[PDB]
């Protein structure tokens, strides 16, 4: 997250870190057994880390649970990042408590102009590289579809939305991929892509989670 703030330990209790020997993407806990992340975060050998604040210090509220199964969307296209969504099943259920909690899936799509909370352990520099240890947060508004298509001509599908600041300076970035965009208390987005981070006229692009709730529900009913 570039231009954000330190969230405060365990104040984003649905945020997970995906670990393959190191943090490499975020995700969102949607019930005791399942995590939503980006398909472009797929790796074999994922351990889900819940209850994290500092990813490099065991502070006492973590749960580390191996994935048993990962399920990339059936129509994910890694060239265009259309349908950039994945489900990860945990080998055992998380113990839900004040610091490890699920985020609700949406019923309706979020409105343009809504301010959402984006969070992660990704890079905090627009130019250059600095990865934080503690969870960072950013409040960013959903942009109109037409502003998002103007920013990325021929690349935005109806399964993507933009959010952020066209003047630059505030954005998600590498290493935040897969993490949450929460708007009015629902998971509405997944950190997906963008041209650089926090660059003028190049806002972040997010997977539009409300288009996938029927897939998520039938998949979790079946696995
Ligand atoms: Ca920790």
PDB file of C-alpha atoms and ligand atoms in Angstrom:
ATOM      1  CA  UNK A   1       0.000   0.000   0.000  1.00  0.00           C
ATOM      2  CA  UNK A   2       1.503   3.361  -1.050  1.00  0.00           C
ATOM      3  CA  UNK A   3       0.327   6.500   0.785  1.00  0.00           C
ATOM      4  CA  UNK A   4      -1.609   4.539   3.435  1.00  0.00           C
ATOM      5  CA  UNK A   5      -1.435   4.219   7.194  1.00  0.00           C
ATOM      6  CA  UNK A   6      -0.602   1.549   9.780  1.00  0.00           C
ATOM      7  CA  UNK A   7      -3.963  -0.158  10.363  1.00  0.00           C
ATOM      8  CA  UNK A   8      -3.442  -1.071  14.001  1.00  0.00           C
ATOM      9  CA  UNK A   9      -2.976  -4.684  15.093  1.00  0.00           C
ATOM     10  CA  UNK A  10      -5.894  -7.012  14.253  1.00  0.00           C
ATOM     11  CA  UNK A  11      -8.237  -4.177  13.285  1.00  0.00           C
ATOM     12  CA  UNK A  12      -8.734  -5.840   9.831  1.00  0.00           C
ATOM     13  CA  UNK A  13      -9.430  -9.341  11.296  1.00  0.00           C
ATOM     14  CA  UNK A  14     -10.447 -10.920   7.927  1.00  0.00           C
ATOM     15  CA  UNK A  15      -7.078 -10.026   6.305  1.00  0.00           C
ATOM     16  CA  UNK A  16      -4.826 -13.078   5.744  1.00  0.00           C
ATOM     17  CA  UNK A  17      -1.258 -13.391   4.550  1.00  0.00           C
ATOM     18  CA  UNK A  18      -0.521 -16.207   2.074  1.00  0.00           C
ATOM     19  CA  UNK A  19       2.903 -17.695   2.837  1.00  0.00           C
ATOM     20  CA  UNK A  20       5.074 -20.076   0.731  1.00  0.00           C
ATOM     21  CA  UNK A  21       8.138 -19.603   2.881  1.00  0.00           C
ATOM     22  CA  UNK A  22       7.559 -15.877   2.725  1.00  0.00           C
ATOM     23  CA  UNK A  23       4.556 -13.538   2.431  1.00  0.00           C
ATOM     24  CA  UNK A  24       3.531 -13.282  -1.216  1.00  0.00           C
ATOM     25  CA  UNK A  25      -0.108 -12.182  -1.398  1.00  0.00           C
ATOM     26  CA  UNK A  26      -3.112 -11.210   0.720  1.00  0.00           C
ATOM     27  CA  UNK A  27      -6.526 -12.822   0.995  1.00  0.00           C
ATOM     28  CA  UNK A  28      -9.816 -12.491   2.848  1.00  0.00           C
ATOM     29  CA  UNK A  29     -11.324 -14.963   5.302  1.00  0.00           C
ATOM     30  CA  UNK A  30     -15.009 -15.498   4.232  1.00  0.00           C
ATOM     31  CA  UNK A  31     -15.884 -18.268   6.768  1.00  0.00           C
ATOM     32  CA  UNK A  32     -13.940 -20.535   9.104  1.00  0.00           C
ATOM     33  CA  UNK A  33     -12.738 -22.778   6.250  1.00  0.00           C
ATOM     34  CA  UNK A  34     -12.349 -20.577   3.145  1.00  0.00           C
ATOM     35  CA  UNK A  35     -10.260 -17.719   1.923  1.00  0.00           C
ATOM     36  CA  UNK A  36     -10.895 -15.542  -1.199  1.00  0.00           C
ATOM     37  CA  UNK A  37      -7.743 -14.250  -3.035  1.00  0.00           C
ATOM     38  CA  UNK A  38      -6.663 -13.430  -6.611  1.00  0.00           C
ATOM     39  CA  UNK A  39      -6.112 -16.254  -9.130  1.00  0.00           C
ATOM     40  CA  UNK A  40      -2.836 -14.599 -10.103  1.00  0.00           C
ATOM     41  CA  UNK A  41      -1.682 -15.383  -6.512  1.00  0.00           C
ATOM     42  CA  UNK A  42      -1.904 -19.074  -7.191  1.00  0.00           C
ATOM     43  CA  UNK A  43       1.120 -21.118  -5.872  1.00  0.00           C
ATOM     44  CA  UNK A  44       1.303 -24.728  -4.756  1.00  0.00           C
ATOM     45  CA  UNK A  45       2.187 -25.189  -1.025  1.00  0.00           C
ATOM     46  CA  UNK A  46       0.275 -22.179   0.482  1.00  0.00           C
ATOM     47  CA  UNK A  47       0.059 -21.699   4.232  1.00  0.00           C
ATOM     48  CA  UNK A  48      -2.676 -19.264   5.284  1.00  0.00           C
ATOM     49  CA  UNK A  49      -1.634 -16.938   8.184  1.00  0.00           C
ATOM     50  CA  UNK A  50      -4.552 -15.358  10.076  1.00  0.00           C
ATOM     51  CA  UNK A  51      -4.431 -12.985  13.008  1.00  0.00           C
ATOM     52  CA  UNK A  52      -1.251 -11.306  11.647  1.00  0.00           C
ATOM     53  CA  UNK A  53      -0.032  -7.834  12.269  1.00  0.00           C
ATOM     54  CA  UNK A  54       3.777  -7.951  11.981  1.00  0.00           C
ATOM     55  CA  UNK A  55       4.385 -10.791   9.433  1.00  0.00           C
ATOM     56  CA  UNK A  56       7.988 -11.170  10.676  1.00  0.00           C
ATOM     57  CA  UNK A  57       7.285 -11.486  14.428  1.00  0.00           C
ATOM     58  CA  UNK A  58       5.124 -14.128  16.165  1.00  0.00           C
ATOM     59  CA  UNK A  59       3.087 -11.784  18.419  1.00  0.00           C
ATOM     60  CA  UNK A  60       0.640 -14.265  19.858  1.00  0.00           C
ATOM     61  CA  UNK A  61      -2.647 -14.024  17.967  1.00  0.00           C
ATOM     62  CA  UNK A  62      -1.722 -15.832  14.767  1.00  0.00           C
ATOM     63  CA  UNK A  63      -3.228 -19.055  13.371  1.00  0.00           C
ATOM     64  CA  UNK A  64      -1.119 -20.771  10.721  1.00  0.00           C
ATOM     65  CA  UNK A  65      -3.175 -23.290   8.698  1.00  0.00           C
ATOM     66  CA  UNK A  66      -2.057 -25.138   5.567  1.00  0.00           C
ATOM     67  CA  UNK A  67      -4.300 -24.928   2.479  1.00  0.00           C
ATOM     68  CA  UNK A  68      -5.839 -28.201   1.485  1.00  0.00           C
ATOM     69  CA  UNK A  69      -7.228 -27.094  -1.805  1.00  0.00           C
ATOM     70  CA  UNK A  70      -7.001 -24.069  -4.092  1.00  0.00           C
ATOM     71  CA  UNK A  71      -9.613 -23.434  -6.821  1.00  0.00           C
ATOM     72  CA  UNK A  72      -8.821 -20.794  -9.505  1.00  0.00           C
ATOM     73  CA  UNK A  73     -11.981 -19.473 -11.219  1.00  0.00           C
ATOM     74  CA  UNK A  74     -12.957 -21.648 -14.190  1.00  0.00           C
ATOM     75  CA  UNK A  75     -12.713 -18.640 -16.578  1.00  0.00           C
ATOM     76  CA  UNK A  76      -9.575 -16.978 -15.165  1.00  0.00           C
ATOM     77  CA  UNK A  77      -7.543 -15.535 -17.997  1.00  0.00           C
ATOM     78  CA  UNK A  78      -3.999 -14.741 -16.761  1.00  0.00           C
ATOM     79  CA  UNK A  79      -3.313 -12.578 -19.853  1.00  0.00           C
ATOM     80  CA  UNK A  80      -6.111 -10.065 -19.226  1.00  0.00           C
ATOM     81  CA  UNK A  81      -6.669 -10.872 -15.508  1.00  0.00           C
ATOM     82  CA  UNK A  82     -10.366 -11.254 -16.287  1.00  0.00           C
ATOM     83  CA  UNK A  83     -11.951 -13.355 -13.467  1.00  0.00           C
ATOM     84  CA  UNK A  84      -8.902 -12.830 -11.183  1.00  0.00           C
ATOM     85  CA  UNK A  85     -10.345 -14.738  -8.227  1.00  0.00           C
ATOM     86  CA  UNK A  86      -9.427 -17.920  -6.379  1.00  0.00           C
ATOM     87  CA  UNK A  87     -10.787 -19.842  -3.376  1.00  0.00           C
ATOM     88  CA  UNK A  88      -8.469 -21.481  -0.868  1.00  0.00           C
ATOM     89  CA  UNK A  89      -9.765 -24.128   1.532  1.00  0.00           C
ATOM     90  CA  UNK A  90      -8.049 -24.475   4.918  1.00  0.00           C
ATOM     91  CA  UNK A  91      -6.995 -27.914   6.106  1.00  0.00           C
ATOM     92  CA  UNK A  92      -8.781 -27.183   9.470  1.00  0.00           C
ATOM     93  CA  UNK A  93     -11.260 -24.512  10.414  1.00  0.00           C
ATOM     94  CA  UNK A  94      -9.903 -21.271  11.869  1.00  0.00           C
ATOM     95  CA  UNK A  95     -10.967 -20.466  15.435  1.00  0.00           C
ATOM     96  CA  UNK A  96     -12.968 -17.315  14.977  1.00  0.00           C
ATOM     97  CA  UNK A  97     -12.430 -14.659  17.666  1.00  0.00           C
ATOM     98  CA  UNK A  98     -12.023 -10.930  17.988  1.00  0.00           C
ATOM     99  CA  UNK A  99      -8.813 -10.856  15.967  1.00  0.00           C
ATOM    100  CA  UNK A 100      -9.676 -13.620  13.358  1.00  0.00           C
ATOM    101  CA  UNK A 101     -13.040 -13.010  11.746  1.00  0.00           C
ATOM    102  CA  UNK A 102     -14.854 -13.483   8.457  1.00  0.00           C
ATOM    103  CA  UNK A 103     -15.863 -10.740   6.087  1.00  0.00           C
ATOM    104  CA  UNK A 104     -19.366 -10.819   4.535  1.00  0.00           C
ATOM    105  CA  UNK A 105     -19.811 -11.405   0.841  1.00  0.00           C
ATOM    106  CA  UNK A 106     -21.886  -8.767  -0.958  1.00  0.00           C
ATOM    107  CA  UNK A 107     -25.520  -8.950  -2.021  1.00  0.00           C
ATOM    108  CA  UNK A 108     -25.380  -5.955  -4.278  1.00  0.00           C
ATOM    109  CA  UNK A 109     -22.452  -4.406  -6.178  1.00  0.00           C
ATOM    110  CA  UNK A 110     -20.854  -1.355  -4.576  1.00  0.00           C
ATOM    111  CA  UNK A 111     -21.601   2.192  -5.802  1.00  0.00           C
ATOM    112  CA  UNK A 112     -19.104   4.467  -7.671  1.00  0.00           C
ATOM    113  CA  UNK A 113     -17.752   7.008  -5.195  1.00  0.00           C
ATOM    114  CA  UNK A 114     -17.981   4.638  -2.183  1.00  0.00           C
ATOM    115  CA  UNK A 115     -14.860   4.836   0.047  1.00  0.00           C
ATOM    116  CA  UNK A 116     -13.500   1.362   0.673  1.00  0.00           C
ATOM    117  CA  UNK A 117     -10.739  -0.006   2.897  1.00  0.00           C
ATOM    118  CA  UNK A 118      -7.826  -1.727   1.048  1.00  0.00           C
ATOM    119  CA  UNK A 119      -5.168  -3.429   3.110  1.00  0.00           C
ATOM    120  CA  UNK A 120      -1.965  -5.467   2.761  1.00  0.00           C
ATOM    121  CA  UNK A 121       1.726  -5.971   3.326  1.00  0.00           C
ATOM    122  CA  UNK A 122       2.719  -4.847  -0.204  1.00  0.00           C
ATOM    123  CA  UNK A 123       5.225  -2.274  -1.286  1.00  0.00           C
ATOM    124  CA  UNK A 124       4.869   1.182   0.152  1.00  0.00           C
ATOM    125  CA  UNK A 125       6.862   3.068  -2.478  1.00  0.00           C
ATOM    126  CA  UNK A 126       5.620   4.365  -5.854  1.00  0.00           C
ATOM    127  CA  UNK A 127       9.224   4.643  -7.032  1.00  0.00           C
ATOM    128  CA  UNK A 128      11.368   2.054  -5.522  1.00  0.00           C
ATOM    129  CA  UNK A 129      10.776  -0.720  -3.025  1.00  0.00           C
ATOM    130  CA  UNK A 130      10.022  -0.929   0.759  1.00  0.00           C
ATOM    131  CA  UNK A 131       7.934  -3.740   2.222  1.00  0.00           C
ATOM    132  CA  UNK A 132       6.432  -3.146   5.592  1.00  0.00           C
ATOM    133  CA  UNK A 133       6.252  -5.662   8.376  1.00  0.00           C
ATOM    134  CA  UNK A 134       2.960  -4.451   9.862  1.00  0.00           C
ATOM    135  CA  UNK A 135      -0.356  -4.330   7.993  1.00  0.00           C
ATOM    136  CA  UNK A 136      -1.049  -1.134   6.040  1.00  0.00           C
ATOM    137  CA  UNK A 137      -4.411   0.317   5.122  1.00  0.00           C
ATOM    138  CA  UNK A 138      -5.781   2.806   2.626  1.00  0.00           C
ATOM    139  CA  UNK A 139      -9.199   4.376   2.163  1.00  0.00           C
ATOM    140  CA  UNK A 140      -9.912   4.760  -1.560  1.00  0.00           C
ATOM    141  CA  UNK A 141     -13.034   5.517  -3.564  1.00  0.00           C
ATOM    142  CA  UNK A 142     -14.462   3.420  -6.330  1.00  0.00           C
ATOM    143  CA  UNK A 143     -14.113   5.312  -9.680  1.00  0.00           C
ATOM    144  CA  UNK A 144     -16.692   5.451 -12.343  1.00  0.00           C
ATOM    145  CA  UNK A 145     -16.636   2.699 -15.070  1.00  0.00           C
ATOM    146  CA  UNK A 146     -16.102   5.330 -17.670  1.00  0.00           C
ATOM    147  CA  UNK A 147     -13.041   6.891 -15.840  1.00  0.00           C
ATOM    148  CA  UNK A 148     -11.616   3.337 -15.332  1.00  0.00           C
ATOM    149  CA  UNK A 149     -12.020   2.475 -19.073  1.00  0.00           C
ATOM    150  CA  UNK A 150     -10.446   5.870 -20.039  1.00  0.00           C
ATOM    151  CA  UNK A 151      -7.458   5.024 -17.834  1.00  0.00           C
ATOM    152  CA  UNK A 152      -6.905   1.574 -19.300  1.00  0.00           C
ATOM    153  CA  UNK A 153      -8.358   1.553 -22.877  1.00  0.00           C
ATOM    154  CA  UNK A 154      -9.317  -1.906 -24.167  1.00  0.00           C
ATOM    155  CA  UNK A 155      -8.377  -3.648 -20.889  1.00  0.00           C
ATOM    156  CA  UNK A 156     -11.319  -3.222 -18.407  1.00  0.00           C
ATOM    157  CA  UNK A 157     -14.040  -5.871 -18.377  1.00  0.00           C
ATOM    158  CA  UNK A 158     -17.327  -5.819 -16.511  1.00  0.00           C
ATOM    159  CA  UNK A 159     -15.563  -8.053 -13.860  1.00  0.00           C
ATOM    160  CA  UNK A 160     -13.181  -5.260 -12.851  1.00  0.00           C
ATOM    161  CA  UNK A 161     -13.486  -1.885 -11.201  1.00  0.00           C
ATOM    162  CA  UNK A 162     -10.994   0.914 -10.516  1.00  0.00           C
ATOM    163  CA  UNK A 163     -10.477   2.575  -7.189  1.00  0.00           C
ATOM    164  CA  UNK A 164      -8.015   5.180  -5.967  1.00  0.00           C
ATOM    165  CA  UNK A 165      -6.780   8.647  -6.842  1.00  0.00           C
ATOM    166  CA  UNK A 166      -6.071   9.862 -10.342  1.00  0.00           C
ATOM    167  CA  UNK A 167      -3.563  12.496  -9.081  1.00  0.00           C
ATOM    168  CA  UNK A 168      -1.301   9.650  -7.905  1.00  0.00           C
ATOM    169  CA  UNK A 169       0.251   9.060  -4.484  1.00  0.00           C
ATOM    170  CA  UNK A 170      -2.223   6.536  -2.958  1.00  0.00           C
ATOM    171  CA  UNK A 171      -2.729   2.976  -4.175  1.00  0.00           C
ATOM    172  CA  UNK A 172      -2.288  -0.688  -3.499  1.00  0.00           C
ATOM    173  CA  UNK A 173       0.889  -2.271  -4.952  1.00  0.00           C
ATOM    174  CA  UNK A 174       2.896  -5.488  -5.420  1.00  0.00           C
ATOM    175  CA  UNK A 175       2.462  -7.816  -2.493  1.00  0.00           C
ATOM    176  CA  UNK A 176      -1.016  -6.502  -1.701  1.00  0.00           C
ATOM    177  CA  UNK A 177      -2.434  -8.716  -4.530  1.00  0.00           C
ATOM    178  CA  UNK A 178      -5.254 -10.979  -3.478  1.00  0.00           C
ATOM    179  CA  UNK A 179      -6.177  -8.847  -0.489  1.00  0.00           C
ATOM    180  CA  UNK A 180      -9.465  -7.191   0.347  1.00  0.00           C
ATOM    181  CA  UNK A 181     -11.316  -4.115  -0.833  1.00  0.00           C
ATOM    182  CA  UNK A 182     -14.124  -3.732   1.761  1.00  0.00           C
ATOM    183  CA  UNK A 183     -16.933  -1.283   1.101  1.00  0.00           C
ATOM    184  CA  UNK A 184     -19.892  -0.811   3.529  1.00  0.00           C
ATOM    185  CA  UNK A 185     -18.719  -3.849   5.484  1.00  0.00           C
ATOM    186  CA  UNK A 186     -18.662  -6.256   2.433  1.00  0.00           C
ATOM    187  CA  UNK A 187     -15.885  -7.733   0.389  1.00  0.00           C
ATOM    188  CA  UNK A 188     -16.400  -5.923  -2.935  1.00  0.00           C
ATOM    189  CA  UNK A 189     -12.913  -6.123  -4.472  1.00  0.00           C
ATOM    190  CA  UNK A 190      -9.665  -8.142  -4.647  1.00  0.00           C
ATOM    191  CA  UNK A 191      -6.349  -6.382  -5.313  1.00  0.00           C
ATOM    192  CA  UNK A 192      -5.708  -7.400  -8.904  1.00  0.00           C
ATOM    193  CA  UNK A 193      -3.537  -5.118 -11.085  1.00  0.00           C
ATOM    194  CA  UNK A 194      -2.613  -1.589 -12.232  1.00  0.00           C
ATOM    195  CA  UNK A 195       0.110   0.135 -14.175  1.00  0.00           C
ATOM    196  CA  UNK A 196       2.847   0.623 -11.548  1.00  0.00           C
ATOM    197  CA  UNK A 197       1.591   1.883  -8.174  1.00  0.00           C
ATOM    198  CA  UNK A 198       0.218   5.257  -7.245  1.00  0.00           C
ATOM    199  CA  UNK A 199       1.109   6.773 -10.660  1.00  0.00           C
ATOM    200  CA  UNK A 200      -0.919   9.700 -12.019  1.00  0.00           C
ATOM    201  CA  UNK A 201      -3.904   8.514 -14.217  1.00  0.00           C
ATOM    202  CA  UNK A 202      -3.249   4.849 -13.456  1.00  0.00           C
ATOM    203  CA  UNK A 203      -5.540   3.821 -10.564  1.00  0.00           C
ATOM    204  CA  UNK A 204      -5.738   0.379  -9.102  1.00  0.00           C
ATOM    205  CA  UNK A 205      -7.867  -2.306 -10.766  1.00  0.00           C
ATOM    206  CA  UNK A 206      -9.779  -4.747  -8.638  1.00  0.00           C
ATOM    207  CA  UNK A 207     -11.721  -7.970  -9.228  1.00  0.00           C
ATOM    208  CA  UNK A 208     -15.472  -7.188  -8.883  1.00  0.00           C
ATOM    209  CA  UNK A 209     -16.447  -9.741  -6.198  1.00  0.00           C
ATOM    210  CA  UNK A 210     -20.216  -9.200  -6.511  1.00  0.00           C
ATOM    211  CA  UNK A 211     -20.106 -10.875  -9.933  1.00  0.00           C
ATOM    212  CA  UNK A 212     -18.777 -14.121  -8.309  1.00  0.00           C
ATOM    213  CA  UNK A 213     -21.010 -14.724  -5.280  1.00  0.00           C
ATOM    214  CA  UNK A 214     -22.994 -17.489  -7.034  1.00  0.00           C
ATOM    215  CA  UNK A 215     -19.728 -19.276  -8.001  1.00  0.00           C
ATOM    216  CA  UNK A 216     -18.287 -18.831  -4.560  1.00  0.00           C
ATOM    217  CA  UNK A 217     -21.458 -20.199  -2.879  1.00  0.00           C
ATOM    218  CA  UNK A 218     -21.791 -23.263  -5.169  1.00  0.00           C
ATOM    219  CA  UNK A 219     -18.115 -24.014  -4.909  1.00  0.00           C
ATOM    220  CA  UNK A 220     -18.089 -23.876  -1.115  1.00  0.00           C
ATOM    221  CA  UNK A 221     -21.278 -26.018  -1.089  1.00  0.00           C
ATOM    222  CA  UNK A 222     -19.418 -28.682  -3.042  1.00  0.00           C
ATOM    223  CA  UNK A 223     -15.860 -28.799  -1.541  1.00  0.00           C
TER     224      UNK A 223
HETATM  225 CA1  LIG B   1       3.048 -12.130  13.285  1.00  0.00          CA
END
